[PDB]
C-alpha cells in the first residue's frame, strides 16, 4: 500500500489508498511488460466458512481507510495510510491526536502509534517510554523489546480562515508535501 492526497483550487479533494498487497505483490513481474502482480487474494481468510472467505468474483477484505474529515459540511482534513491491518490504528490515532489532543498535524502524525489486533500481537513505534512499556506488560500486555514504524500518513489540512492548504508527509517513508501558488 501507499496513500496520497491532493487538493485543488476548485475545492475538489482527493484521498487515495492503493496497493498491490505485499511489497512487490506476489513478486511476479509480467514477462516483457515490467509491472508487478498483486497478491491481494491472500487478504481472504485461508480457512473458509466466514464473512471473508474466498469466492470466485469476490473482493478480499481490505483494511485501507482513505478518509476525509468535515466541519460544517466542508472538507477540512484528509487522512490515510498504508500498513495492512495496522492502517485502522494509524488513521484513528492521527485523528485522535489532531482532534482529541489538539496537536498540530505534523505532531499528530509523528506521535508514536501502537497496534494490537489480539492478545498475541502487539506493536509500537519508538518513543513509547521504557518505564510505561514495562508497566503495560506487567499489567498483561505484550509489547516487545523492539520498536517498529507503523504506517505512513499523508494528510492535507484545508485552512479556510487563513485561505491556505497545509500538507504533511510522515517521516516513515521519504514522502513530501508540495504546495502550488496560482
Amino acid at each position: 500500500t501507499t496513500h496520497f492526497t491532493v487538493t485543488d483550487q476548485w475545492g475538489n479533494v482527493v484521498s487515495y489508498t492503493t496497493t498491490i498487497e505485499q511489497l512487490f505483490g506476489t513478486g511476479i513481474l509480467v514477462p516483457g511488460y515490467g509491472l508487478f502482480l498483486n497478491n491481494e487474494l491472500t487478504d481472504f481468510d485461508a480457512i473458509p466458512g466466514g464473512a471473508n472467505e474466498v469466492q470466485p468474483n469476490k473482493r478480499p477484505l481490505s483494511s485501507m481507510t482513505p478518509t476525509i474529515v468535515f466541519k460544517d459540511e466542508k472538507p477540512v482534513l484528509t487522512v490515510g495510510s498504508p500498513g495492512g491491518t495496522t492502517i485502522i490504528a494509524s488513521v484513528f490515532q492521527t485523528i485522535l491526536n489532531y482532534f482529541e489532543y489538539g496537536m498540530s498535524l505534523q505532531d499528530a502524525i509523528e506521535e508514536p502509534r501502537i497496534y494490537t489486533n489480539s492478545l498475541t500481537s502487539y506493536r509500537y513505534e519508538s518513543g513509547m517510554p521504557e518505564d510505561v512499556r514495562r508497566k503495560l506488560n506487567d499489567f498483561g500486555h505484550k509489547f516487545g523489546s523492539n520498536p517498529v514504524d507503523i504506517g505512513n500518513v499523508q494528510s492535507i489540512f484545508i485552512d479556510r480562515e487563513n485561505k491556505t492548504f497545509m500538507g504533511v508527509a510522515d517521516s516513515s517513508r521519504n514522502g513530501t508535501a508540495v504546495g502550488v501558488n496560482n
Binding site: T2, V6, I28, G34, N38, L41, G50, I68, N152
Partner: protein, 360 residues
C-alpha cells in the same frame, strides 16, 4: 519537504518525484483528479513495490462542484476459478503465508487502471496522454532509487529472484542500492500501449493476455475472460461523527472505515486527552479498545455483495455501550471475543465465525 503550504493546491505523496509530477499538473491548470491519476502512474514507477496497475485501490473524491463525496473502488476480484479452500493443502492445513503469497492463486484481477479511467471520465480535465507521459519518462530513462525502495529490494530478494523481476531489480544477482539508477524498459512500453489504446490493451488485449499467462505459470486459474469481466464500482462513504466533525471513510469491502469509526466511538467517552499522550492509561485504553474492534473485524467483515456486514449494529450507540463495559483501567480484559452487533440490527449473518491463524 515534509510540510508545505499553498494557496491554490496541495499534494502529499510517499515519493518526492510523484509529489512534483502531481504539483506540476495542478500548476498547469489541472484539477486534483488529474493530479491524482498522474501521481498513481508516477508511484507505479518510483514506488513499484507499493502500488500500480497490477493492483487495486480506493479513491475517495469530494466533488467541489456538486459537494458530493464518492469512492472509485478498483479493488481486485477473485478469478472465476478461485475456490474457497485454494490456500489449504492436500492435508487441509493452511499453506504458509510466504508460499501462498507468491503463488498465482494470490493474484486478483487488477483494477487500478480501470479506476483511473472511471475517475478521468467523470472529473478529468487534461488528456490522459499528458497525465501518463511523465511516468513513461521515469520508466524509460530511469531514476536514482530512494532508501525505502532499496531496503524493499534487499528484504524481498528471494521472492524477486524466482521471477522475471530478477534482471531489473537483482542485476548480476545483487540488489540495486540507494542512489542506483532503476530503468524500466518494459514498464515504459506498457504505459505507451495504454497511452495509445487505453485500458482495452489491459482488460481485452495483449497486456491482459500476458497477465493471465504468467498467473497460470505460477499456478492460478485467471483467464483472459476474468480480465474482460472486470469493472470498478462506485461507493458512497460510510459516515461518522467525532468530536463535532463529520467523517467520511471507506465502507465494505474495506474493514477500514467502519472499524476506525468504531474505535473512535468506543474511546470517545473516555476523554483520552486527560492522559498524557505517552501515558500508561492512554496506551492501555487504546490497546483494550483495539482488541474489541479487531475481534469484530475478524468475525463480521467481507465483500458486502456476498455477505452481510452489520454496519448499523457495529456502530449502534447501545452496542458501543455494551462493548465499553469491557474497557477499563482496572485490569486487562481477557474476554476479547467479537461482540453481538446483530442484536441491534435487522437480520442474521450468512456465514460461520471461523478462527484463522496469525501467520500473515
Amino acid at each position: 519537504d515534509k510540510v508545505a503550504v499553498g494557496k491554490d493546491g496541495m499534494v502529499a505523496t510517499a515519493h518526492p518525484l510523484a509529489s512534483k509530477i502531481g504539483a506540476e499538473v495542478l500548476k498547469k491548470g489541472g484539477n486534483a483528479i488529474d493530479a491524482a491519476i498522474a501521481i498513481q502512474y508516477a508511484l507505479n514507477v518510483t514506488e513499484p513495490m507499493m502500488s500500480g496497475i497490477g493492483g487495486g485501490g480506493f479513491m475517495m473524491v469530494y466533488d467541489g462542484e456538486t459537494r458530493e463525496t464518492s469512492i472509485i473502488n478498483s479493488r481486485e476480484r477473485a478469478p472465476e476459478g478461485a475456490k474457497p479452500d485454494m490456500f489449504l493443502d492436500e492435508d487441509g492445513k493452511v499453506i504458509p503465508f510466504s508460499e501462498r503469497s507468491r503463488h498465482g492463486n494470490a493474484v486478483g484481477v487488477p483494477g487500478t487502471l480501470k479506476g483511473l479511467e472511471a475517475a478521468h471520465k467523470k472529473w478529468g480535465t487534461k488528456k490522459l496522454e499528458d497525465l501518463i507521459s511523465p511516468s513513461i519518462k521515469l520508466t524509460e530513462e530511469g531514476f536514482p532509487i530512494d532508501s525505502v525502495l532499496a531496503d524493499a529490494i534487499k528484504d524481498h530478494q528471494d521472492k524477486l529472484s524466482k521471477t522475471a523481476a530478477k534482471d531489473i531489480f537483482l542485476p548480476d544477482g545483487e540488489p540495486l542500492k540507494e542512489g542506483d539508477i532503476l530503468v524500466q524498459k518494459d514498464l515504459a512500453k506498457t504505459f505507451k500501449l495504454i497511452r495509445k489504446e487505453g485500458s482495452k490493451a489491459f482488460y481485452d488485449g495483449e497486456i491482459g493476455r500476458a497477465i493471465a499467462d504468467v498467473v497460470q505459470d505460477f499456478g492460478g486459474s485467471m483467464t483472459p475472460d476474468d480480465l474482460s469481466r472486470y469493472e470498478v464500482t462506485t461507493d458512497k462513504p460510510i459516515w461518522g461523527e467525532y468530536h463535532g466533525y463529520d467523517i467520511a471513510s471507506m465502507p465494505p469491502p474495506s474493514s477500514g472505515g467502519v472499524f476506525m469509526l468504531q474505535v473512535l466511538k468506543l474511546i470517545d467517552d473516555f476523554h483520552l486527552s486527560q492522559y498524557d499522550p505517552k501515558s500508561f492509561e492512554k496506551y492501555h485504553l487504546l490497546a483494550e479498545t483495539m482488541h474489541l474492534s479487531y475481534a469484530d473485524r475478524a468475525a463480521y467483515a467481507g465483500d458486502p455483495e456476498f455477505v452481510d456486514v452489520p454496519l448499523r449494529g457495529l456502530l449502534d450507540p447501545d452496542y458501543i455501550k455494551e462493548r465499553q463495559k469491557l474497557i477499563s483501567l482496572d485490569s486487562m480484559n481477557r474476554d476479547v471475543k467479537e461482540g453481538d452487533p446483530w442484536k441491534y440490527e435487522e437480520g442474521e449473518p450468512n456465514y460461520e465465525i471461523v478462527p484463522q491463524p496469525e501467520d500473515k
